[PDB]
Amino acid sequence: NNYSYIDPTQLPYDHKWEFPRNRLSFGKTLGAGAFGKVVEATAQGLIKSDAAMTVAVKMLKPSAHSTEREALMSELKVLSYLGNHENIVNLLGACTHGGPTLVITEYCCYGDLLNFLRRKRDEFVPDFLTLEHLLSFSYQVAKGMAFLASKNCIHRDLAARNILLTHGNITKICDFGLARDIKNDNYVDKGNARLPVKWMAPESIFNSVYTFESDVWSYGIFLWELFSLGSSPYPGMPVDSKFYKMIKEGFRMSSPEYAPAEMYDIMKTCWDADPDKRPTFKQIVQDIEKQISES
Question: Outcome of mutating residue 6 to A, per the record?
Answer without folding.
Answer: Reduction in SH2B2/APS binding. Abolishes SH2B2/APS binding
